[PDB]
Amino acid sequence: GRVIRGQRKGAGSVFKAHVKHRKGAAKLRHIDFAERHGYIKGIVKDIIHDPGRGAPLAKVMFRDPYRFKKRTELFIAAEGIHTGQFIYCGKKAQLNIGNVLPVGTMPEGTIVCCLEEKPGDRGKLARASGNYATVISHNPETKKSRVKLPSGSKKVISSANRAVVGVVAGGGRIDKPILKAGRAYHKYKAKRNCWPRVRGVAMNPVEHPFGGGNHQHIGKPSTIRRDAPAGRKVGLIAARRTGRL
Amino acid sequence: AKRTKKVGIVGKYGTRYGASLRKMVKKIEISQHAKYTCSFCGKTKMKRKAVGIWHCGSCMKTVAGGAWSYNTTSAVTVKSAIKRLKELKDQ
Amino acid sequence: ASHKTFRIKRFLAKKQKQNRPIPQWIRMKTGNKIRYNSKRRHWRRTKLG
Amino acid sequence: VQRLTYRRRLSYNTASNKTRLSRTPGNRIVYLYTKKTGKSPKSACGICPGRLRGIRAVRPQVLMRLSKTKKHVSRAYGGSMCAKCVRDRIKRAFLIEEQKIVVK
RNA sequence: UGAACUAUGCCUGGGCAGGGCGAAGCCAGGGGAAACUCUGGUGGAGGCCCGCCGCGGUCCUGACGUGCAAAUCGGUCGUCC
RNA sequence: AGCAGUUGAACAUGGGUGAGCCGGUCCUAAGGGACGGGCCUACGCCGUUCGGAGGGGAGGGCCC
RNA sequence: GACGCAAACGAACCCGGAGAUGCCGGCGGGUGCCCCGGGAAAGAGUUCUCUUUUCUUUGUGAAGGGCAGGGCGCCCUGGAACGGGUUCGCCCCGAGAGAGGGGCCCGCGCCCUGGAAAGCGCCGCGCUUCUGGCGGCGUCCGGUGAGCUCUCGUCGGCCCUUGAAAAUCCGGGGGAGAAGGUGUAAAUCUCGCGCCGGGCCGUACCCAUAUCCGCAGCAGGUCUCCAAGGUGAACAGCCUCUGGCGUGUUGGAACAAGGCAGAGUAAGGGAAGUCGGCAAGUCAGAUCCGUAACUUCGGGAUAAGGAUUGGCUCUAAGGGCU
RNA sequence: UAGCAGCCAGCUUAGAACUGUCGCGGACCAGGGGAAUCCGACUGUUUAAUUAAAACAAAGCAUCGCGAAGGCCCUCGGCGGGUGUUGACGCGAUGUGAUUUCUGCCCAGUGCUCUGAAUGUCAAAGU
RNA sequence: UAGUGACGCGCAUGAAUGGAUGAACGAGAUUCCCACUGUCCCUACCUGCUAUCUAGCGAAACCACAGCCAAGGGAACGGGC
RNA sequence: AGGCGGGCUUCUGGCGUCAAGCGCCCCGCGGGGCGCGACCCGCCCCGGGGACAGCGUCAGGUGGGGAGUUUGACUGG
Ligand SMILES: [Mg+2]
Ligand SMILES: [Mg+2]
Ligand SMILES: [Mg+2]
Ligand SMILES: [Mg+2]
Ligand SMILES: [Mg+2]
Ligand SMILES: [Mg+2]
Ligand SMILES: [Mg+2]
Ligand SMILES: [Mg+2]
Ligand SMILES: [Mg+2]
Ligand SMILES: [Mg+2]
Ligand SMILES: [Mg+2]
Ligand SMILES: [Mg+2]
Ligand SMILES: [Mg+2]
Ligand SMILES: [Mg+2]
Ligand SMILES: [Mg+2]
Ligand SMILES: [Mg+2]
Ligand SMILES: [Mg+2]
Ligand SMILES: [Mg+2]
Ligand SMILES: [Mg+2]
Ligand SMILES: [Mg+2]
Ligand SMILES: [Mg+2]
Ligand SMILES: [Mg+2]
Ligand SMILES: [Mg+2]
Ligand SMILES: [Mg+2]
Ligand SMILES: [Mg+2]
Ligand SMILES: [Mg+2]
Ligand SMILES: [Mg+2]
Ligand SMILES: [Mg+2]
Ligand SMILES: [Mg+2]
Ligand SMILES: [Mg+2]
Ligand SMILES: [Mg+2]
Ligand SMILES: [Mg+2]
Ligand SMILES: [Mg+2]
Ligand SMILES: [Mg+2]
Ligand SMILES: [Mg+2]
Ligand SMILES: [Mg+2]
Ligand SMILES: [Mg+2]
Ligand SMILES: [Mg+2]
Ligand SMILES: [Mg+2]
Ligand SMILES: [Mg+2]
Ligand SMILES: [Mg+2]
Ligand SMILES: [Mg+2]
Ligand SMILES: [Mg+2]
Ligand SMILES: [Mg+2]
Ligand SMILES: [Mg+2]
Ligand SMILES: [Mg+2]
Ligand SMILES: [Mg+2]
Ligand SMILES: [Mg+2]
Ligand SMILES: [Mg+2]
Ligand SMILES: [Mg+2]
Ligand SMILES: [Mg+2]
Ligand SMILES: [Mg+2]
Ligand SMILES: [Mg+2]
Ligand SMILES: [Zn+2]
Ligand SMILES: [Zn+2]
């Protein structure tokens, strides 16, 4: 047979991202002496819509401490901020919405967003619209903390990872039901070439391990092992259980 | 005055998409297009510009709020929770 | 087309000068051995690419 | 009624292939290619939606041949900031520098 | 060795008569004790309808079938913000 | 030139395209593709704003 | 005061603007075209009868100066409820309306320089390869429109769609520096004018029922711009003017059968034909009435089912300006 | 002062009389209709050159993997590359196919998955 | 022998290998009714372009030799014996 | 690779650019330079893992994702 549609997505020919009209990479300010021993003042200039995601981005303009220049940072717009307000990033920053203070200096039960996995990566966890991570507990002995990622998994990260307080804007976006296939067409036309998903049973055995047969049955257990080769690993990969639940 | 008994704004979809689906989009298309009172000027001109973006036509204040409403119910409870955690952090 | 490059226009100039008929005195010089140019091309029948 | 044609190689209705009808001294109606409309400058404040006043609305490279007085006003931030946001910057700078005296 | 055809994606341009039903919003006049209702007008929404160019190609299993054509022609027909 | 022709996009002999202000040239879009580095037994390939001691313009009379 | 004056020093560095933003809808300004009124001028057509008739022609470039017109969350005075202003729709106002007086922007419209000398229209004379030249007169006065396009504005609508980069150009912040000591100097965003230069390449023609592709002058295929009069809702169909053409690789004489097509027509019956209402036949626009079962209350629906329609002569209602 | 006079300007609507052979959307343009069954919800897409459909897609619904030293996938190769200018309201892999109403019993078989050196089988190296 | 409504020990219906239902929608499959019509009873007539004839021009598939039948025999259906 | 290890900015959609000052020194009232201002010392730029990931090479399991091939004969077809 030939290669399945899933194998062709790794080549990156027509399945690359559509990043022409995107406004940049949303990431926190790189950690420097100002964010380690104090705080830096920044002004929110504009809240723009990034084509491809459901969460707005804020263009916060800080002041460079070593040269006469004003840096522009493209943050994740936490729900509640507005243009013209001041955002303070650093250790000594107060516990307000929008500020970027390390998780080690936050009380237990804080709602953060754009959390950092490791110190310096400029914000990875809890970055989609309406999502957040809660700080569960601290540990001054091992300099570690425990946060609750939006997937429900409790991850143990360092106490120096910075995060934006407050939930991400654009919450409740998945509540409005898409009514037309055209709204789903324009939804993915800005993300990537992945929308029309042809079922494996609707294909021939050459293109998919589920195709073929005078009926449209699967014919084999859809639950597939994890060590299955690329080309066979379709359906339910390493399914611990199935059913309605 | 009233030209539609039940549909209202979703009458633009006709007989398509079903009854229960058109009932759920109605409560959202109303709050999505409605103009809210600007908390910085008092003028009811806070209309939604993009997904999660709310702009005012008088003071030009852009606020990052909910997708279909001005402020989601989750963000209101968080803002009051952060204000409570901040007070106990100092004292 | 009307928008040509210098190399293409220089290539069409040579093919235009090669498409000339054989001189009359060549026929009498060769004793009617070379009577007609065997490489005459027509703009409708043969295309030069 | 006469049906006139284009006057250049470009035969499409692009953003630069814009024309207008003009009546020549020879009692004809021919196309006359116009330049794209310019835009007056905006305020550097990023708040006021209206454009600036007292400034020509031409193309960028046309501003090279204009005189300086045709490109700004005689105010402090003239040509780059509106008058309403200048007087607010003056009051904001004065009042903030006054609170920093009370603290001492 | 080929994406001058075609399949999908990207960048940058161009194009799509005339009509029909007519949603939110708004104005006015009536009914009410409040909840709130009724009539007219306005407004111009839609993978909405008839439909030209366009783009497609149903039926006649028509014409043609050493053809105009190694897939075309006519009527009819689908769709046309 | 599927009849003809005193005709032709045929044949023969000559002639014809003139720019500072029309377009190319100039710019980067998708994208292609060097440089550093890595890889390949190799011809070479991967990769594209990242990565090398990657700065050969500006100013004060030798500074930056 | 918005901001205006012909100019009106200024580095590093910084900030900002323009380049540079979608689709759709409504409205308004301007051109082009069309139309109407001159019982307008110059030629032509018609005249058997009528026709102060019918047809054609009646002009201004870029750039600059001035003025209409359009737009403006631009300024000053002032202060609003008996709320007022206002759009087709909206929208606007104590974060300051209405009103009065100003400022700026766009002006592709009109006048002027250009510029009538030229271009068209008409008439006369000279001349027949210098001849293939010289003269005369005219190029006028208004109207509007649910008209059609183009364009500039303006107010909206839609998006789980937010609808490009860079060269290049400009303004501001900044005050490092430079200029002369009593008439000039530094510096001038030509600031009025003058002087010199602008190389290289493409440029003919066809652009499609004979200049491209399909073996061809192949009923196929191939990206765009301009686009008139009448009927009509129409860029539908039918007819006409400008422009183009000879019927699409041939003429002549016949009108048998049998074909293709004209979606030719038909007595009485009306699907009995046939696998099957295949085929084509009925219906069809518009106005006024009238529209069920069912339904997700949106629809069904142009449901179904009726009436009216020409021509001619009148009447009534719907405007603007002084 | 229950507004009038003068002038100008079009294009529509309604009613009435009269009239021709009861003919009048006169050519042209231009839906036959109704009662039901089957399938697909709809719009869209598809076998260029015999199949335009009940097939594909679809929104909705549901399951599955993965917190980045990761899930899925590419390359002969660089711990190179795609999703990723991404971060669970996300990406990847499947089935069903709008809305309404429901979705029962079976984990023995196959398959997936978890538990574990606490007992069998058990390679290379080491002893 | 079709269509529809019922009956169900159903060779071999059945619940997201989704069951039941369904307004609107369909160049999807099927049945009946009204109107309509040369589909038919049962064919006839007219017209355009051809066929036909003529001037000019002028191919191709095909072809063992060829071309009247009955019966007989024969490789069990001859054109030839 | 902008402040690591050891002994001074939260009231506003302003402003912040090569140092004012002080000390000392060198030239022709005019110039220039140095130090403090801007603490001292040091071994890795700063963080997160760390002899575990990973790499090279054998071994076992899994492996229709992919490759090669086979899939008897007789026979009232
Ligand atoms: Mg199949
Ligand atoms: Mg199968
Ligand atoms: Mg199925
Ligand atoms: Mg089975
Ligand atoms: Mg050719
Ligand atoms: Mg156009
Ligand atoms: Mg477009
Ligand atoms: Mg309908
Ligand atoms: Mg069509
Ligand atoms: Mg067509
Ligand atoms: Mg097709
Ligand atoms: Mg056809
Ligand atoms: Mg046929
Ligand atoms: Mg035939
Ligand atoms: Mg011939
Ligand atoms: Mg000739
Ligand atoms: Mg020749
Ligand atoms: Mg552009
Ligand atoms: Mg654009
Ligand atoms: Mg508009
Ligand atoms: Mg006012
Ligand atoms: Mg300046
Ligand atoms: Mg030419
Ligand atoms: Mg021809
Ligand atoms: Mg006949
Ligand atoms: Mg016939
Ligand atoms: Mg009959
Ligand atoms: Mg019969
Ligand atoms: Mg029968
Ligand atoms: Mg039919
Ligand atoms: Mg019906
Ligand atoms: Mg049934
Ligand atoms: Mg059936
Ligand atoms: Mg369908
Ligand atoms: Mg086909
Ligand atoms: Mg499933
Ligand atoms: Mg299906
Ligand atoms: Mg089940
Ligand atoms: Mg089991
Ligand atoms: Mg029957
Ligand atoms: Mg039955
Ligand atoms: Mg069963
Ligand atoms: Mg079963
Ligand atoms: Mg079944
Ligand atoms: Mg339809
Ligand atoms: Mg269909
Ligand atoms: Mg049907
Ligand atoms: Mg369809
Ligand atoms: Mg024989
Ligand atoms: Mg195999
Ligand atoms: Mg084989
Ligand atoms: Mg055998
Ligand atoms: Mg035997
Ligand atoms: Zn406001
Ligand atoms: Zn401003």
A16 strand F contact, CB < 7 Å? yes
The Cα-based distances of C5 to A5, B18, B30, B79, C1 in angstroms read: 44, 62, 61, 68, 10
d(CA D67, CA D73): 12
| CA gap A172, B32 in Å, rounded | 12
Dihedral of alpha carbons D80, D84, D85, D91, sign: positive
Specify the DSSP element, H or E, that contains A135.
strand A133-139
List the 185-224 stretch of A: residues with Cβ below 8 A of B: none
For A112, A135, A175, D42, D85, the CA distances from A83, given in Å and listed in that order, are: 20, 28, 27, 18, 16
Helix H or strand E encompassing A39: strand A39-48
Q: Does B57 touch chain A (CB under 8 A)?
A: no
- Cα angle for residues A45, A19, A115 (degrees, 5° grid): 60
* Residue (of B6, B30, B32) closest to B20 by Cα position: B6
Question: CB of C40 within 8 A of CB of C34?
Answer: no
Taking the C1' atom of every nucleotide in all shown strands and the CA of A232, the nearest one is J65
How far from each other are the two terminal CA atoms of chain A, in whole angstroms?
36
What is the number of alpha carbons within 13 Å of residue B55 lying toward its C-beta? 13
Rounded to 5 degrees, what are φ and ψ at C17?
Answer: -80, -20
CA dist., res. A165 & res. A122, Å (int): 14
Give the containing element (helix H, strand E) for A8. Answer: helix A5-8
Experimental method: cryo-EM
3-state secondary structure chain D: CCCCCCCCCCCCCCCCCCCCEEECCCCCEEECCCCCCCCCCCCCCCCCCCCCCCCCCCCHHHHHCCCHHHCCCCCCCCCCCCHHHHHHHHHHHHHHHHHHHHCC
User: How buried is A128 (Cβ within 10 angstroms: 0-12 exposed, 13-18 middle, 19+ buried)?
Assistant: middle
Whether residue A158 contacts residue A68, with contact meaning beta carbons closer than 8 Å, is answered with no
- Please identify which residue in the block is written with the tokens 């020549």: D24
Asked whether at least 3 C-beta pairs link A and B within 8 Å, the reply is yes
Contacts of residue A118, defined as CB under 8 A and 6 or more positions apart, other chains included, come to: A157, A158, A161
Question: Which residues on B lie below 8 Å from D49 (Cβ)?
Answer: 60
Matching residue, tokens 């952090």: B89
What single-letter amino acid sits at D81?
Answer: M
Encoding tokens for residue A205?
A: 């055995």
Resolution in A: 3.2
CA–CA distance, B87 with B19 (Å, rounded to integer):
49
Rama region for D79: left / alpha / beta (φ>0; ψ in -120 to 50; rest): left
SS3 content of chain B, % helix, strand, coil (to 5): 45, 15, 45
**CA distance to A1, A11, A186, C38, per residue, from A209 (Å):** 9, 20, 30, 63
Report the alpha-carbon distance of residue A136 to residue A149 in Å, rounded.
10
Residue A6 to residue A230: CA distance in whole angstroms: 9
